[PDB]
């Protein structure tokens, strides 16, 4: 167990860092939306950079999904000890954080789509 | 155990079929973005952003298809009158290549049109 | 053995070189797109979309070159008077760095030029 819990905590740390990375990328995406729609003529490099953050978010999100699935399957295999509860409780928390950040990301995109349509109509 | 490896082959096949469908769907969306962009009297930077996103996803997905099909191609050349199971694998790999060439050919055609239609639009 | 790892190093070098030439090709094409966009009184959404596609690709490719060089740099730090193989690797790494900076410098200058010319046109 100690060796297997040590690894579990290594996994949780990586997931947290990935989630923070998405969080930071989502703030940045929001800044790119604002910059693109603020100026008469957008800097091209603001549109290319928006694409690059989205690519990074897709790639990072996939990794969080995989790693979270890994933990989930390991819980189902052992399925109640202190260690298993710990793992169950941490997975739940990471799932909540991850869904929260992605939900915020979708809202940010929806607003870009709406606001760009309003600019187009002006 | 062949059964183990055939089951896996058929799973690899479904993966590839899902990725090709994903490409097909993106190509239709690329055409809609082309139409929205060319039909509007003003820029819409979301439409431009989404077109670019779609082209990035097509590229990424197609690369995976090429890789996965390649991997199957090699697996066949190594094992290769072929047995029944080998024939099953070759025939399926052929079918997937055709579909994949067909969706990418349609993508290219779609892009050839955007280029031509955007020049016409520009000339108005 | 060293041999197998120098062979690998030189293969890594060639791949990094192909990526840099790829960026260089694309930077010229970005220039061409800049010309087309400025020489045309109206927008051409194909030219604009394709400019953006090229920028995307430069950015992805540049990124891979940065990571591939960082690996080489990190391998030199651990092994690191140096042996001849080690020296060979440092010299090549340094040359590859120079060449990469040069091409991205060219890319920024190209973007700065467009921005300026564009503003001028806008005023005309």
Could you give the CA distance from residue A27 to residue A6 in angstroms, rounded to a whole number? Answer: 32
Long-range CB contacts (within 8 A, 24+) of B13-22: B13/B92, B13/B96, B15/B68, B16/B65, B16/B68, B16/B69, B16/B96, B16/B100, B17/B96, B17/B99, B19/B61, B19/B64, B19/B65, B19/B68, B20/B65, B20/B96, B20/B99, B20/B100, B20/B103, B22/B57, B22/B61
State how far the Cα of A81 lies from the Cα of A69, in Å rounded to an integer: 21
Kindly list the residues of chain B whose beta carbon comes within 8 Å of any beta carbon in chain C. Answer: 37-38, 43, 48, 51-52, 55-56, 114-115, 118-119, 121-122, 124
Q: CA C93, CA C76: separation in Å to the nearest integer?
A: 9
CA distance B62 to C77: 37
Q: Angle, to 10 degrees, between the axis of helix A2-38 and the axis of helix A82-121?
A: 10
Domain that holds residue B46: 2-124
What are the tokens at C1?
A: 């053995």
Q: Which residue in chain C has the smallest CA separation from B117? A: C46
Structural tokens at position A43: 């800097």
Contacts of C51 in chain A (CB under 8 A): 44
- ∠ CA A114-C111-C92 to the nearest 5 degrees? 120
CA dist., res. A9 & res. A22, Å (int): 20
- Two tokens, residue C116: 């300026």
Structure letter (DSSP) for residue A41 = S
Alpha carbon distance A24, A30 (integer Å): 10
Under a CB-based contact definition with an 8 Å cutoff, are residues A76 and A91 in contact? no
Q: Using CB atoms, list chains with 3+ pairs below 8 Å to chain C.
A: A, B
List of residues 6+ apart from A3 with CB closer than 8 A: none
Q: How many CB pairs under 8 A join A and B?
A: 34
Token output for A49: 């950079």
| Neighbour-count burial for A42-55, b at 16+ CB within 10 Å, e otherwise | bebbbbbbbbbbbb
A102: burial class by Cβ within 10 Å (0-12, 13-18, 19+)? middle
Q: Which residues contact C124 (CB under 8 A, 6 or more apart)?
A: none
Give the Cα separation of B31 and C20 in Å (integer).
Answer: 32
> Angle between the B45-79 and A82-121 helix axes, to the nearest 10 degrees?
130
Please state, in angstroms and rounded to a whole number, the distance separating the CA atoms of residues A19 and A101: 8
Reported as type and span, the H/E element at residue B108 is helix B84-123
Compute the distance between CA of residue C63 and CA of residue A59 in angstroms, rounded to an integer. 15
Interface probe with B: pick from C36, C46, C47, C50, most Cβ of B within 10 Å: C46
User: How many contacts, defined by CB atoms under 8 Å, are there between B and C?
Assistant: 33
**Can you spell out the DSSP letters for chain C?**
-HHHHHHHHHHHHHHHHHHHHHHHHHHHHHHHHHHHHHH-SS--HHHHHHHHHHHHHHHHHHHHHHHHHHHHHHHHHHH----HHHHHHHHHHHHHHHHHHHHHHHHHHHHHHHHHHHHHHHH-
Distance CA C53, CA B114 (A): 14
CA atoms within 13 A on the CB side of B114: 25
User: Do C56 and B56 lie within an 8 Å CB cutoff?
Assistant: yes
Structure token pair of residue B57: 């996803």
Here the CATH number for the domain that contains residue B103 is 1.20.58.70
Q: For residue B121, which phi and psi values (nearest 5 degrees)?
A: -55, -55
Count up the domains in chain B and report the number. 1
Contacts of A119 by beta carbon, 8 Å cutoff, 6+ apart: A37, B42, B44, B45
Residue of C78, C85, C98 lying closest to C17 (CA atoms): C98
- C-alpha neighbours within 13 Å on the C-beta side of residue C104: 16
Contacts of B47 in chain A (CB under 8 A): 116
- The 8-class DSSP code of residue A40 comes to S
Q: Whose structure tokens read 């010309």? A: C35
Question: Any long-range contacts for B85-88 (C-beta under 8 Å, 24+ apart)?
Answer: B85/B2, B85/B6, B88/B6
Within a 13 Å sphere around the CA of A47, how many CA atoms are in the beta-carbon half?
Answer: 25
Tell me the backbone φ, ψ of residue C42, rounded to 5 degrees.
Answer: -100, 165
């Amino acid at each position: 167990r100690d060796k297997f819990m040590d690894e579990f905590f290594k996994q949780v740390e990586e997931i947290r860092q990935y989630i923070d990375r998405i969080a930071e990328n989502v703030e940045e995406v929001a800044r790119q939306h604002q910059a693109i729609l603020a100026s008469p003529n957008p800097n091209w490099f603001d549109i290319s950079q928006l694409l690059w953050l989205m690519a990074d978010i897709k790639e990072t999100a996939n990794e969080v999904r995989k790693k979270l699935k890994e933990i989930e399957q390991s819980i189902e295999q052992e399925e109640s000890s202190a260690d298993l509860k710990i793992r169950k409780r941490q997975h739940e928390e990471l799932e909540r954080k991850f869904r929260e950040v992605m939900k915020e990301y979708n809202a940010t995109q929806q607003d870009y789509r709406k606001r760009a349509r309003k600019r187009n109509l002006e």
